[PDB]
Amino acid sequence: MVENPMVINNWHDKLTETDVQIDFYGDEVTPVDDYVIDGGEIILRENLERYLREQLGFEFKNAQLEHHHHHH
Amino acid sequence: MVENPMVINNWHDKLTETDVQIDFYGDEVTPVDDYVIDGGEIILRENLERYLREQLGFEFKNAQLEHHHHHH
């Protein structure tokens, strides 16, 4: 028996996801759900249209460093 | 020299991949060489244009679990 001056949100009950993947928007991607991975990020097929119109850019990497050839 | 404890036993600390990754073919991709990731799989930017032609950065992951309800 405990008390609470106001109704605060405690942990209550919480578990860890075994291998459950979530999309970029933070819904939930189940084995019975269609999704697409854009380069490396997971997007649920429903939110995909929005995300594609934003990025549709896969994962584009480079050296980033840009080692300056040799110069001389 | 022996007998005098100058040596100790340790584990195989560094076994897991640190910053080392590989492309689709099996070369080796580091933060020095330019590369692109198509839906989770790494490809050297040397062959990436070909990969974007066939895959295009998207790993299409439909449910693929369409077990239609049928008793017999």
Curated annotation (Swiss-Prot), chains A, B:
Record's Pfam families? Yqai
Q: Between which residues do disulfide bridges form?
A: none
**InterPro entries assigned to the protein according to its UniProt record, in alphabetical order:** Uncharacterised_Yqai, YqaI_dom_sf
Transmembrane residue ranges: none
Which SUPFAM superfamilies does the UniProt record give?
A: YqaI-like (SSF160713)
Q: Where along the sequence do coiled-coil regions lie?
A: none
Taxonomy, superkingdom: Bacteria
Q: Provide the protein name.
A: Uncharacterized protein YqaI
Q: Which organism is it from?
A: Bacillus subtilis (strain 168)
The gene name reads: yqaI
